[PDB]
Ligand binder design. Structure first.
Ligand SMILES: CC/C(=C(\c1ccc(O)cc1)c1ccc(OCCN(C)C)cc1)c1ccccc1
Ligand SMILES: CC/C(=C(\c1ccc(O)cc1)c1ccc(OCCN(C)C)cc1)c1ccccc1
Ligand SMILES: CC/C(=C(\c1ccc(O)cc1)c1ccc(OCCN(C)C)cc1)c1ccccc1
Ligand SMILES: CC/C(=C(\c1ccc(O)cc1)c1ccc(OCCN(C)C)cc1)c1ccccc1
Lengths: 227, 223
């Protein structure tokens, strides 16, 4: 119960942060291939990392394996983009994928189409920047993205605890009540923009085949044999 | 003010659009023909609705268009979820056009889209979403679809109005905070459904103007 209390949860997420991933640009001037290559290599590394991070969130380990895989599968692009926005929050106009990989808007034009994605990331980052998004609020929101990715007893509980944690953090700020409700709303409403950039990103990534298993999974869940 | 805004959103509600099913057993075509007929009629009314929203008509004609342009599919799906809320397992497109999850199989693909809607509606049903709450959430979907002075002002006012609505409930503060988070967290699912629907709708050619639109804004000549 307590390991899931505002200060406890905040503490655990504070130290669950994945390790920073390093990567440096290539020799020649960026092309569409080299560009994506770097970002893919980079995205894959952080993903292996995103697993051990999820495992450290109070109780994630007790959710069925199917649900673990489900949430991570449904929310991984949003989690990446939020990690990316967060670390690019104090450097307006630039996306800090990694220390030696600090690309500004224009360089994205190396990979046809990513431009609109870069602007979405850049514009959402700005919103968090005006809000003066704090590291503690950030940690709660990232985890919330993980648990709010799809839609039980445990799941919802785990999610509401992360929610209670964020109210708590915003609460130790001193601002009145009406401004605590406002910040909560503003912060959460940016979740639509994150999800949206994720969908846009997925679509673009996909552009650059398996057997449909949607019905079968329902059948399986319905029969109750899924994991 | 909160009470004012609510009252104004209430009476700003679009009329209910009446449409009926066709003769023969729904075909992928006929099915999508009925939904498209319905949506366009609703979209027509949507403009009028957005115009009644306090302050909207003051935003440059460009922002108005941009907002409606980017949020219309969510607004629609939000309206659909609201009227299907008391009909589990069903999507109430109109009084005469109600479809079960299974009938959606008339149009190849929309099934996953129908499950997204029914499940979100399911979530709102479990939160016992209230009419006034719904009113605020809708305008909120319209006003938060894109990313100024008046804009944010307008958006924070509806947001104030929502907190206010949740406040006359009487639940403790911790619970009021909880409900605001749970409702707004549900926006991400609404936006997600919308993106999925757009992808599918699109599946069933113009010149890229994105870069040109930026320049035009940079040069400050856009509307
Ligand atoms: C938004 C930049 C980005 C990726 C990214 C975002 C944040 C971050 O911290 C690191 C990378 C990106 C690039 C590739 C990618 O594919 C990996 C394939 N794996 C899952 C096998 C995922 C995200 C991207 C997504 C779609 C198209 C083009 C670029
Ligand atoms: C590429 C998406 C994905 C998984 C996936 C890929 C294809 C598919 O058909 C279904 C899922 C994924 C998600 C979770 C996972 O967990 C292993 C079990 N627990 C103990 C971590 C493995 C792959 C994932 C990988 C790393 C981080 C976040 C998400
Ligand atoms: C969710 C069902 C739906 C539509 C809908 C939602 C709510 C509502 O109240 C009425 C209809 C839908 C159908 C067609 C559509 O395109 C119309 C073309 N216009 C833009 C000229 C938009 C939404 C739909 C969306 C994508 C693919 C197939 C069906
Ligand atoms: C189809 C999307 C759209 C508009 C649109 C289409 C293509 C494009 O390149 C840009 C926009 C749209 C939105 C608003 C609008 O309003 C007119 C200005 N005042 C009277 C509000 C006209 C078209 C729309 C129309 C009705 C309801 C909701 C959305």
């Amino acid at each position: 119960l307590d390991a899931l209390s505002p200060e406890q949860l905040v503490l655990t997420l504070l130290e669950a942060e994945p390790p920073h991933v390093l990567i440096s640009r290539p020799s020649a001037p960026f092309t569409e291939a080299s560009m994506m290559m770097s970002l893919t290599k980079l995205a894959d590394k952080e993903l292996v990392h995103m697993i051990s991070w999820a495992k450290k969130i109070p109780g994630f380990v007790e959710l069925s394996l199917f649900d673990q895989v489900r949430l991570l599968e449904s929310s991984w692009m949003e989690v990446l983009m939020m990690g990316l926005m967060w670390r690019s929050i104090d450097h307006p106009g630039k996306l800090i994928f990694a220390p030696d990989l600090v690309l500004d808007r224009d360089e994205g034009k190396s990979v046809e189409g990513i431009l609109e994605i870069f602007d979405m990331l850049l514009a959402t980052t700005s919103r968090f920047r005006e809000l003066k998004l704090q590291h503690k609020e950030y940690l709660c929101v990232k985890a919330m993205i993980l648990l709010n990715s799809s839609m039980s007893r445990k799941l919802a509980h785990l999610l509401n605890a992360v929610t209670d944690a964020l109210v708590w953090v915003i609460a130790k700020s001193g601002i009145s009540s009406q401004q605590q409700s406002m910040r909560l709303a503003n912060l959460l409403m940016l979740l639509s923009h994150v999800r949206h950039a994720s969908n846009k990103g997925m679509e673009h990534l996909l552009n650059m085949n398996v057997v449909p298993v949607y019905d079968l999974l329902l059948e399986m869940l319905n029969a109750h044999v899924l994991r």
